[PDB]
Amino acid sequence: NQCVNFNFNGLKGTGVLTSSSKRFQSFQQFGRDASDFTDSVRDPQTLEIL
Amino acid sequence: GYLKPLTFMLSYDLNGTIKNAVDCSQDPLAELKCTIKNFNVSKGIYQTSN
Ligand SMILES: *[C@@H]1O[C@H](CO)[C@@H](O)[C@H](O)[C@H]1NC(C)=O
Ligand SMILES: *[C@@H]1O[C@H](CO)[C@@H](O)[C@H](O)[C@H]1NC(C)=O
Numbered sequence A: 001n002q003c004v005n006f007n008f009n010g011l012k013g014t015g016v017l018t019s020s021s022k023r024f025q026s027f028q029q030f031g032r033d034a035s036d037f038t039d040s041v042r043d044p045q046t047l048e049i050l
Numbered sequence B: 001g002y003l004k005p006l007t008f009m010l011s012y013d014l015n016g017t018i019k020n021a022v023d024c025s026q027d028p029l030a031e032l033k034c035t036i037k038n039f040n041v042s043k044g045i046y047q048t049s050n
């Protein structure tokens, strides 16, 4: 819930909070969408997705 | 069978799996589908790419 800069092996600075993240299949890390905007990334060691 | 250099149109479902495909070099209907980039074509007359 703050304007942060995350480095989940890639750099981008936005805000963060908890995601449902239904669409995570086949060893996925970042849940991109149309126009390549980044949302729904997961912790690289745990399974929780923000 | 042997592979050839061709142009294909691919579709992805809600789970991220390929469910349909169109070979654009088969018939004029497939060429029309690949020109407008849709699996459903309405009634009319359209110009197609080679
Ligand atoms: C990765 O190691 C950290 C401690 O460095 C631990 O908290 C975390 O649970 C570990 N993850 C796995 C999947 O073992
Ligand atoms: C997508 O995957 C889920 C996994 O539980 C499955 O239940 C569902 O039927 C799949 N959707 C389609 C359209 O196949």
Ligand SMILES: *[C@@H]1O[C@H](CO)[C@@H](O)[C@H](O)[C@H]1NC(C)=O
Pocket (backbone or CB within 6 Å): B039, B040
């Ligand atoms: C488009 O074509 C598919 C395949 O025949 C058909 O099942 C579907 O209902 C059609 N979609 C629309 C929007 O008409």
